[PDB]
DNA sequence: CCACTGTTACATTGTAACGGCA
DNA sequence: TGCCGTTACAATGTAACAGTGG
């Protein structure tokens with residue numbers, strides 16, 4: 001029972017931590033580049049109008 | 051002369067269109083993702099501000 | 101170096117390339133003996149979930165022919181994967197009839213520019229006519 | 236009907252296509268149970284070198300949803316096979332940067348022409364402009 | 370149609386429910402769209418109908434009803 | 442020099458959508 | 464309608480050229 005429960009706990013911990021690490025990194029990236037692209041686009045729009 | 055200038059204007063217009071479409075697509079994808087993570091995995095687990 | 105090299109991605113690409121080549125029937129192995137080739141392929145198959153060891157399997161049993169094609173294919177795949185992020189960096193594939201393509205390629209080779217550049221110049225002349233018509 | 240259909244050729248095409256799809260993981264057969272699907276796939280595998288029986292195999296075990304895709308794939312294969320004989324009937328494939336393609340497709344949709352026709356007309360106009368200047 | 374393409378754009382650019390987006394639903398208070406969110410909403414509205422809007426006249430739009438009124 | 446990378450111009454196969462025609 | 468040609472793509476693989484730095 002001890003062996004099984006320890007294996008289950010280790011598997012859960014590793015899976016959860018690695019999935020969060022894999023996903024949140026790219027999510028934050030996409031957010032940062034989205035902000036940057038919006039900032040870039042505003043100036044072009046302003047110049048274009050005049 | 052005016053036509054020559056409007057050529058640069060159209061170039062800038064194409065650039066602005068490209069940037070705007072990119073930003074709009076990014077925003078739409080972000081909104082779709084947020085609506086797909088209504089399972090409550092986003093509040094802190096996905097949004098690791100660190 | 102313009103594109104970041106990611107090891108755990110390029111390794112998976114390489115493994116998939118090897119497996120695809122094998123299942124197509126080509127001799128990825130450098131072994132002429134059937135038994136050693138089969139064993140090496142089986143080990144490669146076992147290496148599915150361990151892309152890191154795939155580089156070593158390459159250095160031990162990869163056919164000497166395939167270095168150039170390998171280094172070409174993974175390079176192109178990297179370029180395409182990084183360009184696919186944004187539309188404005190993507191590429192569009194189109195098909196052209198032989199007479200049309202012949203004329204276009206002759207014109208491009210005349211002007212010493214790529215096909216996209218020649219099309220840009222052509223469409224820009226047409227749009228200049230349109231602009232002047234509009235004013 | 237423009238291209239004559241040859242059984243020993245199109246049947247080999249169909250066999251190769253189905254084997255490729257099976258190797259790719261596509262469910263070739265209509266049997267959800269794995270045993271019947273595997274048995275039918277083995278029948279197909281050992282069925283190589285046979286048009287008159289691969290056709291029957293298709294009629295009997297083929298997945299309903301793949302009929303249209305297989306039919307159009309064979310259509311394209313036939314057309315390409317017949318067109319690849321002569322240089323002038325062949326087709327040249329190129330890759331265009333997205334902005335250039337966007338503008339070209341805009342023009343083509345605007346004028347109702349195809350990409351080939353639109354580019355031909357534009358090149359002819361470019362030549363005409365050259366002659367005008369010259 | 371335009372009067373439902375507007376809802377399609379607003380819902381998929383702010384992520385709010387189609388039921389939530391009524392004619393009088395204001396973006397900031399009802400739909401919750403803040404500064405950048407409203408900027409992206411107006412940009413998407415511009416893209417959908419391939420038109421352009423003045424800065425002041427665009428910023429004047431702060432509701433679904435106003436959005437359609439300027440669009441139609 | 443040499444190797445490794447980026448890019449263009451193809452090929453090859455597959456697919457969905459139109460439109461013609463029995 | 465269902466078949467049949469036809470177009471416009473997408474995805475991947477290669478050869479060839481041009482750059483870059485060790």
Ligand SMILES: *P(=O)(O)OCC(C)(C)[C@@H](O)C(=O)NCCC(=O)NCCS
Nearest residue numbers: 042043044045046047403404405408424
């Ligand atoms: P939100 O509180 O982040 O506000 C965003 C913004 C309204 C300031 C922004 O979208 C914006 O409009 N920036 C440009 C403002 C302007 O009129 N500048 C002149 C042309 S560059």
